[PDB]
Design a protein around this ligand. Structure first.
Ligand SMILES: O=C(O)Cc1ccccc1O
Ligand SMILES: O=C(O)Cc1ccccc1O
Ligand SMILES: [Co+2]
Ligand SMILES: [Co+2]
Lengths: 381, 381
């Protein structure tokens, strides 16, 4: 069931912020590789002497890329006189984050009704504060609490254009790329111990465990009331023949952090075609495809959902398919987005659970561990 | 004249190394924006636990992009047991460089006859050592001395494939991009004081001042014996109405460093067409074009070198033209390559000075300061 125990009003995923060494180059790579438009900036040209921040958008999906300038540019500033557009930014925290983790997600931001209420109630309920509520131009309130590792859960709330002090990019620089991605479906964290992580986060949010349906991990999923904010969390399982990829993550990331973002497409076939066309010319690479035996086995499992043509199209693109009690899930995983084997991206599309589509329709692919192992016995063939 | 006073045998520009926060994303951006192939790697997959290094090539042009992993991966190593493929790399120096300068060039590498000789003779003649000669796999010798700021001049010499411990990229990942760029023509440094910089560098190389032919800079050019290694150096001039861009550089870079790389194309028209097509989809932007009056004035200066059609093609692409006593220079400048207004790139092609083409044929564009100022009086039109 769903007890709907959110301790404050949570709306939707609002944006994801990457902390970078150079925001320009990461943003331009992601824009081409994923098909996202440059839509806002806050940097030297907008008066920001503290950080460079570039926003990419695709549908409702908002990726923010931020890097620090030299502290010398803003050395005479103090917090009351700051030119930073994101008041929680701090040169030392950002350099320390990036040197410790490399390229990765600093903030998972959700839109709430009242960011100040959400911050107070969260801290009242165990959340470790990270940046207190700050009202920007009497219009937007932002607050941050620790999520896991050095990742913050950022609350944003609007009285009624991204953030004050961001400018819309003059569209001579804004090329209308679009490969079909429309919103963030869920965000996945890796921790050394799942239980305490769950207890902490569920402790201060009231998010409930999302109901689900021997290789490497245990996981569980936290969800908001309407189950549109979904936050899976993994822990490693040790002693296994193949080393736990969760453990590999923790080693190369220097501890807990965000493992991957799941991006919903409105047409996963066109998204993967478009992304794969660009893999070797600046975009993203994809995990190796499952063997043909995996795809033959797809008819017996989802032959009622997908035509033979649609199945054959899943095979051309390397798409995985899983199915819940309520819907069917199409998914695929990129290779790591940067130098370290840490953060990656998953492209997904859900079919079923109409009534709008309810959140998590089809689950998260748990069934594909078994299906891929058994399929990999294609050595017989 | 040219006294040919090189104190050791210098061959050609060999490569440029960028020090990055994340080498993967910078390299993939540069590859698409400039049309360079992925040709070698040294990283986790090759046994390197210290740094990630990716090599892009176009003709003879070699761009190397390097970033540090977590020190924890190599904490049990010492220099005799290192897995780094570039023995001069050091986690602390790289993080300190990047935090101080942002994305930029760490090494200007030239190939010499004997890197050990070049290092000893240079230090004997005033060069500040940076990394002593090291022989890699009994095949390649590398040595580094300080050039200016935190930029090193790196010597490389081969007994007789980039460097030992680098693998050729398996070409499923190596897409044969090519927009016409073929080699590095010259590399430009900005310093606070030109005179001491010249005296130091000419002091330990024997490079001579390259003979040339009121807004912002003084500059001078150092050259090797056959004048194929060219190293211009700028200093700011203060008190000017418009602030010195050299000074702006020094402020945002936190001191002296490499200002820009000049890349020779074999077809500057195709290069700029191809680069401009990609400016807004992950590539590089170009400085704003000169006014039409600049291009009308081109007939009277280079009408004997370029047809009206070729001139009109210069106007479509924003190409600048200057002319020496010996040849004609076509040039254009990108906007900054990363977040800070520091490093950028120039695309060039030279016509004249046949006998092969002698180095610096057409100069470096000094004449375009005056031509652009006078051309900008198009307000009358
Ligand atoms: O970590 C993964 O590879 C995928 C994942 C993450 C979290 C919960 C369930 C799940 O299948
Ligand atoms: O700095 C620049 O913009 C161009 C330059 C650099 C160095 C020498 C001569 C010259 O025209
Ligand atoms: Co998932
Ligand atoms: Co130049």
């Amino acid at each position: 069931k769903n007890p709907k125990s959110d301790k404050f009003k949570v709306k939707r995923f609002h944006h994801i912020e990457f902390w970078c060494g150079d925001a320009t180059n990461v943003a331009r790579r992601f824009s081409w590789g994923l098909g996202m438009r440059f839509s806002a900036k806050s940097d030297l040209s907008t008066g920001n002497m503290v950080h460079a921040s570039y926003l990419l958008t695709s549908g409702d999906l908002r990726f923010l890329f931020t890097a620090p300038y030299s502290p010398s540019l803003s050395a005479g500033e103090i917090k009351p006189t700051t030119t930073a557009s994101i008041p929680s930014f701090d040169h030392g925290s950002c350099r320390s984050f990036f040197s410790s983790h490399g390229l990765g997600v600093r903030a998972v931001a959700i839109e709430v009704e009242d960011a100040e209420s959400a911050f107070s109630i969260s801290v009242a309920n165990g959340a470790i504060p990270s940046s207190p509520p700050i009202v920007l131009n009497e219009a937007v309130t932002i607050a941050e609490v620790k999520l896991y590792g050095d990742v913050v859960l950022r609350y944003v709330s609007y009285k009624a254009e991204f953030l004050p002090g961001f400018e819309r990019v003059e569209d001579a620089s804004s090329f209308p790329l679009d490969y079909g991605i429309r919103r963030l479906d869920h965000a996945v964290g890796n921790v050394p111990e799942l239980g305490p992580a769950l207890t902490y986060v569920a402790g201060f949010t009231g998010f409930h465990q999302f109901a689900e349906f021997e290789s490497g991990l245990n996981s569980a999923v936290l969800a908001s009331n309407d189950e549109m904010v979904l936050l899976p969390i993994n822990e490693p399982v040790h002693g296994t023949k193949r080393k736990s990829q969760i453990q590999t993550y923790l080693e190369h990331n220097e501890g807990a952090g965000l493992q991957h973002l799941a991006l919903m497409s409105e047409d996963i076939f066109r998204t993967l075609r478009e992304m794969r066309k660009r893999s070797s010319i600046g975009g993203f690479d994809f995990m190796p495809s499952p063997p043909p035996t995996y795809y033959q086995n797809l008819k017996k499992r989802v032959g009622d959902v997908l035509s033979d043509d649609q199945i054959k199209e899943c095979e051309e693109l390397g798409i995985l398919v899983d199915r819940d009690d309520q819907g069917t899930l199409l998914q695929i995983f990129t290779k790591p987005l940067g130098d370290r084997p840490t953060i990656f991206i998953e492209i997904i599309q859900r079919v079923g659970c109409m009534m709008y589509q309810s959140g998590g329709c089809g689950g998260f692919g748990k069934g594909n561990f078994s299906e891929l192992f058994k399929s990999i016995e294609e050595y017989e063939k």
